[PDB]
């Protein structure tokens, strides 16, 4: 349900988790 990781989901994305 979260193809979009680097920003949904923070431990996989960083990026996004800031």
Do not use: I, M
């Not at 979009?4 to 988790?17: D, E, H, T």
């Amino acid at each position: 349900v979260a193809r979009g990781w680097g920003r949904k989901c923070p431990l996989f994305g960083k990026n996004k988790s800031r």
